[PDB]
Amino acid sequence: QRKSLLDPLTQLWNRAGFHALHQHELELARASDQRIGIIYSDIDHFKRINDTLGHRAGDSVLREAASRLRAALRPEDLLARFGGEEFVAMVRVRETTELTMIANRIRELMEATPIDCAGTSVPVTISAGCTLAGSGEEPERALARADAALYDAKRAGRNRVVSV
Amino acid sequence: SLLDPLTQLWNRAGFHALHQHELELARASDQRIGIIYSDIDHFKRINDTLGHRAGDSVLREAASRLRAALRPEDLLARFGGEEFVAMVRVRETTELTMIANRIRELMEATPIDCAGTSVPVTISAGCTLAGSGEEPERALARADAALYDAKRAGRNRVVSV
Numbered sequence: 339q340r341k342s343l344l345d346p347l348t349q350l351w352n353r354a355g356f357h358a359l360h361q362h363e364l365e366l367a368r369a370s371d372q373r374i375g376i377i378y379s380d381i382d383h384f385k386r387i388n389d390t391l392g393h394r395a396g397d398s399v400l401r402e403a404a405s406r407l408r409a410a411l412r413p414e415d416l417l418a419r420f421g422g423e424e425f426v427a428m429v430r431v432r433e434t435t436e437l438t439m440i441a442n443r444i445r446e447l448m449e450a451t452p453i454d455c456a457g458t459s460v461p462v463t464i465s466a467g468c469t470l471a472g473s474g475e476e477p478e479r480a481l482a483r484a485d486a487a488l489y490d491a492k493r494a495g496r497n498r499v500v501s502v
Numbered sequence: 503s504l505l506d507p508l509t510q511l512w513n514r515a516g517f518h519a520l521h522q523h524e525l526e527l528a529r530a531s532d533q534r535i536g537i538i539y540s541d542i543d544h545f546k547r548i549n550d551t552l553g554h555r556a557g558d559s560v561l562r563e564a565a566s567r568l569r570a571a572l573r574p575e576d577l578l579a580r581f582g583g584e585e586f587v588a589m590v591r592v593r594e595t596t597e598l599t600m601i602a603n604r605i606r607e608l609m610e611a612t613p614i615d616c617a618g619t620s621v622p623v624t625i626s627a628g629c630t631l632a633g634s635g636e637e638p639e640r641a642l643a644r645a646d647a648a649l650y651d652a653k654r655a656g657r658n659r660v661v662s663v
């Protein structure tokens with residue numbers, strides 16, 4: 339099947355599939371009088387995990403992450419993995435306060451429970467940047483603003499959310 | 503219209519009027535009609551010890567917390583007394599039970615402000631899914647009965663049936 343729109347490892351959307359889904363969400367969003375929020379998150383200290391315990395361990399962390407995230411969001415919310423240890427969500431909401439709240443939700447639940455990697459339990463946190471797609475703003479533009487907030491989130495110490 | 507004057511929530515009439523529409527909706531998205539039936543615990547004690555204005559305020563804050571604790575499409579109603587009925591489309595009763603306990607918890611999490619008087623309140627609920635072609639009223643009764651068991655068991659308690 340023409341399933342090259344998925345991330346093989348986690349079965350989430352990949353960068354390409356994610357970007358194609360934008361337009362239709364723009365439709366839905368204007369439709370239901372909602373806003374389009376992006377949450378861009380990244381697993382903290384991922385190399386440390388990988389280099390220390392091996393690629394399988396890291397792939398395990400990634401799989402557990404994708405799963406927790408998927409489970410913490412409504413069915414219609416887009417969730418993707420572009421590569422590395424980063425998960426990007428797109429949610430239809432009313433205002434940014436709600437987006438931040440969703441972001442810290444994901445963050446806390448990732449922090450709340452360690453992850454089993456071949457009998458070795460590994461504690462992980464996640465950082466996120468999040469923003470609303472501006473009125474008449476293009477998709478990539480908002481994505482980059484969220485990527486940049488994520489950067490600031492890492493710099494500010496990690497395990498935190500930066501709403502912008 | 504089809505509203506409870508006091509709280510501007512649906513009344514028994516408004517409830518039954520939407521039901522058939524909720525059936526159609528539930529069928530479309532392969533969901534089940536969930537009913538949560540709840541009653542404020544020890545409500546007369548409040549009315550007596552602080553007055554009908556107070557009792558009426560507690561009722562107003564509940565409608566507001568409940569309503570804020572559900573999604574817009576979830577039906578929230580007050581038939582009368584101090585009881586709030588909710589109708590929510592879901593896929594299995596564990597989900598209905600969680601929703602119920604959530605409402606219960608937030609009701610207990612914060613006293614209710616009665617004009618410079620914060621009063622602790624709790625709520626009890628009984629919940630159930632409607633069977634295929636079941637009369638709303640039958641489902642209503644089953645949840646009302648579980649609500650009763652929840653009261654008899656000690657209140658501040660959910661009974662899923």
Ligand SMILES: Nc1nc2c(ncn2[C@@H]2O[C@@H]3COP(=O)(O)O[C@H]4[C@@H](O)[C@H](n5cnc6c(=O)[nH]c(N)nc65)O[C@@H]4COP(=O)(O)O[C@H]3[C@H]2O)c(=O)[nH]1
Pocket residue numbers: 410411412415429430431432436439440570571572573574
């Ligand atoms: N697309 C999307 N939107 C989200 C998500 N989480 C939150 N929101 C939005 O943010 C609003 C406020 O959410 P809230 O503070 O959690 O406050 C929530 C929450 O207390 C309650 N609640 C509603 N649905 C659920 C649920 O499926 N699980 C849990 N635990 N609580 C819920 O209802 C309140 C408001 O319901 P809403 O009117 O729907 O209002 C929501 C909703 O539009 C999400 O994962 N995806």
Ligand SMILES: Nc1nc2c(ncn2[C@@H]2O[C@@H]3COP(=O)(O)O[C@H]4[C@@H](O)[C@H](n5cnc6c(=O)[nH]c(N)nc65)O[C@@H]4COP(=O)(O)O[C@H]3[C@H]2O)c(=O)[nH]1
Pocket residue numbers: 409410411412413571572573576590591592593597600601
């Ligand atoms: N109509 C209706 N259905 C409800 C309500 N609450 C829960 N559900 C349903 O119950 C499922 C699981 O809820 P969950 O355990 O809280 O697990 C939730 C929860 O962690 C997260 N969550 C989703 N929306 C919200 C929200 O608005 N606020 C908060 N705090 N959490 C949410 O998404 C997870 C699953 O989302 P779902 O796929 O949508 O799946 C949901 C959803 O179908 C409600 O107030 N109204």
